[PDB]
Amino acid sequence: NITEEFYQSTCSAVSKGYLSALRTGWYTSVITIELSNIKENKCNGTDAKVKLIKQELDKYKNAVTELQLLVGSAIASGVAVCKVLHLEGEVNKIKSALLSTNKAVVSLSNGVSVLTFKVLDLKNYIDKQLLPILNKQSCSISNIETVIEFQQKNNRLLEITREFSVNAGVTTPVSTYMLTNSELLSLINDMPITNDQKKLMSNNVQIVRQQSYSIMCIIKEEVLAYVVQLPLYGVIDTPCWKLHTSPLCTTNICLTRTDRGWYCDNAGSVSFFPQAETCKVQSNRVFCDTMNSLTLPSEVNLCNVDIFNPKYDCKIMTSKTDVSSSVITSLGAIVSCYGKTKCTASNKNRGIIKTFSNGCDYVSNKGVDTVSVGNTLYYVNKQEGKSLYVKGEPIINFYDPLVFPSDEFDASISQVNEKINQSLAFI
Amino acid sequence: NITEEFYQSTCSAVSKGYLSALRTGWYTSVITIELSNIKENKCNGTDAKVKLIKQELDKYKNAVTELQLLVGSAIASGVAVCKVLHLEGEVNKIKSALLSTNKAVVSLSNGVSVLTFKVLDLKNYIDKQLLPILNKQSCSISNIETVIEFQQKNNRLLEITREFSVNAGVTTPVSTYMLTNSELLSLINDMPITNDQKKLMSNNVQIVRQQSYSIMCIIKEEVLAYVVQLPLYGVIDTPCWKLHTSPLCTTNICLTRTDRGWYCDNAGSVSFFPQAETCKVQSNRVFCDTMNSLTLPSEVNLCNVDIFNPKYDCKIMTSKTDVSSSVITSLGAIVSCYGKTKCTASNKNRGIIKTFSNGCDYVSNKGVDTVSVGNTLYYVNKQEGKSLYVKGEPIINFYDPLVFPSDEFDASISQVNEKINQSLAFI
């Protein structure tokens, strides 16, 4: 279950109980489509069915012509494996590898082993069910069903070409055109990873797609091969907690904790994700990626329970920005109401049930459903869980608004204290 | 080729050898689709083929009804040309110009000359191959092929309508539906520009789409005309270099160069792009746009070779943020490792090959393939090139951590030096 606590000492909420799934590695698979080489239709006539076939084959030719025209780095592995594929004598190895069945494990020149799927079989249909069936003497097809089937088998290449032209070679997330669900699940169940990671990643294909990349690789020698870059979750089932902060001001000077975001346990340290877009929450997991993360010693947990600890000084922002605002955390809401603005929390049926005063306050989602600040209306999350409210005395009251350095952006607690001491010693 | 250098004096990397392609101008073309006006089907019957035809024509009517419901500015030129089109007596000129062929050059009321292409000919099919073929006496069509052909010719308008409804009138990038590759290439080969810019922009249609805008213009008088806003590259083939910076700290105070991004030569000055998403790199070119750029004197190059130059002071950020991090530049990687965090560089087959010490260090992509910082795993680019490592002494060591102004965000070298001098004079 998910449990939330609210420290009034620093006006900050912590939501714990989450589990982890960290994108730590990249795996590169090579998806190959077997195309066919055709010059032109020998026969010509006024039949409309052959006109439809000619139009469809011309669209296929245009599609195959289009594909011949194509901090950290998120696509470095795919670029490396594409450079490997461009090496001579490598495409033929793949093409001769998965000839009897559409699943192979191949070793390239660089020594890296990759999985190969033959996801489409367009060559067989074009060269064995269109050219021989089409009788060039009469230039007519008896059944329109053949044309309808061609339109039902050539769509996938057209959609792949369209997506690659729109996104300019690299696309994300991988769509159902580029990788069907059955194939994605099969590749997941055959990827070189533990059975623990294969049971968390089969049930969450909704997010594997969002965190995957796909890069156009090769069209040469009647084989359209592109690299799909799946993630490998190297950290699974470790506790994580989200930290939300709100402005805290006197009734002025404002001190806001400036380390909002996700924290996850990782090999004895804490992986810190400041960006909210980085992480995603399905039920109680965080599907974050370490590419947008920092590494911190395992004492940042002490910041949440003691703002004045001596082992790891926290980070704050000091400013005279006296503006009311609210943060809709999970299982509740934090409101900071100052000035003449009216702030309230309203139930769905009992209307206004609170008359928020000046300062920082917190309301659980048990009962409270909407929060009005000024006129802005926020809806609180309705996730079931237990909330705890620890009372205290706001930190900003301990300081004095006479030598307060209301100019910093984010230094630390210790830096603010030493600046205050220097200012006091100056007088 | 691409050449990288790493200055340890400021812990910054420069990647040179790139070429330029700057989006300097906008060109507006008018893409017109000739629709047809139809009231309703006179005949009615229980035949299923006529039901399919009625459904398709009703979808066409709904699509045509939908389109009647529709720092710097990136769409100012298109808005201006649309305002020109809304003027009376202008749509008829376009309609009567491209009457004999689907290519025209027209002069509007404002005097600006624009290219007009008729990309679709739906009116001819609807009014000359559907109404006369459909015999209203029997209300039946002999061949289902006519319906299948209608479904293969009406998809374009449906997709255009869908994209315009989703994106609310303005769309980017121009997808394959709204402008096919052959049409885009013909428009490129007939646009009013030099043959030099027509040979760089034909081979890079993958990026012209991404940097182009398309806006709905007019539906009045059975002509659906929308403006495609292509870019005009006014600066081509000038040297460009990318500048990457990493935190530099003592073993504390941290001084980071704060001018990351692209630099390009431009008419004797330097165009500076701070945003990384602004520029795109296909092989060795930068397809940037000047709308997100600054202009600097041609002495910012001296910042890279002499941090303490007297002609153009550089820009720095001073803070006590002692956090380890890495920057994956092209052809190598910069790693700044501080505190107790473990930082290493690992080969694919030889495993860990380095044991990075505290400070800033740099590893080329020759051999080094992965970089581990804490637990975050980064993959270095595998682009072939030459790396150079110039030794020196870190600039931060020259300062003293006693009067250091660890509060600024980005002032300059000169401002930091004068603040240090003022602090020294105060004592």
Epitope: L19, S113, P192, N195, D196, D237, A267 | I352
Partner: T-cell receptor, first 110, second 112 residues
């Protein structure tokens, strides 16, 4: 009967390098899972020797080495001494058997 | 200072039930995985049971599936393995071994 195959015993003289092989199938070393080399001196709990198939934990002498290629892994000991006589186990994964472990190589000094 | 001390072993008649406990100290237990591995006297090693940090990814091999039940209690840093319906095998040493990541992604990490 183990998933992987290992020589029953290898021998050598002091100052001589010895190579121990770890061979497996497709759903094995193949597909590139990894191999890990564990040491066991009798009467003592097993100790990690080589992890990630090439690296080395701190506190292990540099004379040890490990590598892999195609479908076979190797562990090389350079400069054999009396303290290296032990049971050596090679480890990898299996899509149908999970953690496999080796059959045990008994290395002794002559 | 990673200490893994295991206890609870003793003589049991065939077909009996048994419990084995493992206490871990000196490291953050809640993030590292755990495993139980066998070693018959004079025979090779053989993996027996696995569990992850969140106690919701259980894993057994095919031969011992449905008999051995593993459960980690995170409150006092404890691991337990319950053995039902013993057979002639399973005799020997049982090791409570911490599965420790941070050797890159690398699937199988490095149980130290």
């Amino acid at each position: 009967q183990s998933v992987l195959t290992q020589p029953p015993s290898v021998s050598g003289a002091p100052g001589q390098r010895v190579t121990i092989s770890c061979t497996g199938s497709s759903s094995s070393i193949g597909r590139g899972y990894d191999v890990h080399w564990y040491q066991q001196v009798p009467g003592t709990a097993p100790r990690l020797l080589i992890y990630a198939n090439t690296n080395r934990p701190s506190g292990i002498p540099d004379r040890f080495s490990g590598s892999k290629s195609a479908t076979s892994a190797s562990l090389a000991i350079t400069g054999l001494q009396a303290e290296d006589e032990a049971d050596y186990y090679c480890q990898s994964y299996d899509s149908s058997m999970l953690w496999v472990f080796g059959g045990g190589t008994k290395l002794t000094v002559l | 200072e990673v200490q893994l001390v295991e206890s609870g072993g003793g003589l049991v008649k065939p077909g009996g039930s048994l419990r084995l406990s493992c206490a871990a100290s000196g490291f953050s237990f809640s993030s590292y995985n755990m495993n139980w591995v066998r070693q018959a006297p004079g025979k090779g090693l053989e993996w027996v049971s696995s569990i992850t940090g969140g106690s919701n990814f259980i894993d057994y091999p095919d031969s011992l599936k449905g008999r051995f039940t593993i459960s980690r209690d995170n409150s006092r840093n404890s691991l337990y393995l319950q053995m039902n319906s013993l057979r002639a095998e399973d005799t020997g040493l049982y090791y409570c071994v911490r599965e420790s990541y941070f050797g890159s992604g690398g699937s199988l990490n490095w149980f130290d």
